[PDB]
Write a protein that binds this ligand. Structure first.
Ligand SMILES: *[C@@H]1O[C@H](CO)[C@@H](O[C@@H]2O[C@H](CO)[C@@H](O[C@H]3O[C@H](CO)[C@@H](O)[C@H](O)[C@@H]3O)[C@H](O)[C@H]2NC(C)=O)[C@H](O)[C@H]1NC(C)=O
Ligand SMILES: *[C@@H]1O[C@H](CO)[C@@H](O[C@@H]2O[C@H](CO)[C@@H](O)[C@H](O)[C@H]2NC(C)=O)[C@H](O)[C@H]1NC(C)=O
Ligand SMILES: *[C@@H]1O[C@H](CO)[C@@H](O)[C@H](O)[C@H]1NC(C)=O
Lengths: 37, 49
């Protein structure tokens, strides 16, 4: 939008996060296939 | 947990989550400052394994 670039403006995920018990965060930086268990 | 500059009052006793990490007594227990180290459900040597 006007700036000829792409950037994040929304993180419309959640409104509270009271008791936190696990956290991990990566080091910072087609077909995609996944299995979850 | 221990080296922190200003503790809570008992009336305001803090509490930490310790998780996803390795918990040694190897330093902790052997620091000669601890006037008390009293364990009820396990003996002090069996905490590491
Ligand atoms: C609180 O933080 C203190 C600073 O990191 C830490 O003190 C350090 O304790 C270790 C022993 O666990 C000492 O290690 C050295 O001991 C002798 C020194 O001659 C050497 O044989 C060793 O190879 C090693 O170099 C540090 O000297 C000591 N540092 C200071 C400033 O006192 C405490 O152990 C921490 N305590 C807790 C409970 O977190
Ligand atoms: C997670 O946080 C909530 C938020 O307070 C805690 O829920 C309280 O738990 C006590 C004990 O069961 C109840 O008497 C309260 O009415 C609860 N309040 C609410 C808003 O839920 C809960 O204890 C926390 N979980 C853990 C494991 O600490
Ligand atoms: C344009 O990109 C910049 C980041 O380079 C950002 O600050 C700005 O808010 C963006 N504006 C629009 C309308 O996308």
């Amino acid at each position: 939008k006007n700036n000829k670039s792409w950037m994040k403006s929304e993180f419309r995920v959640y409104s509270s996060a009271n008791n936190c018990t696990f956290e991990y965060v990566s080091q910072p930086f087609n077909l995609r296939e996944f299995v979850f268990k | 947990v221990f080296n922190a500059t200003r503790f809570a009052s008992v009336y305001a006793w803090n509490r930490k989550r310790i998780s996803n990490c390795v918990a040694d007594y190897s330093v902790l227990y052997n620091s000669a400052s601890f006037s008390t180290f009293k364990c009820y459900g396990v003996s002090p040597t069996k905490l590491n394994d």
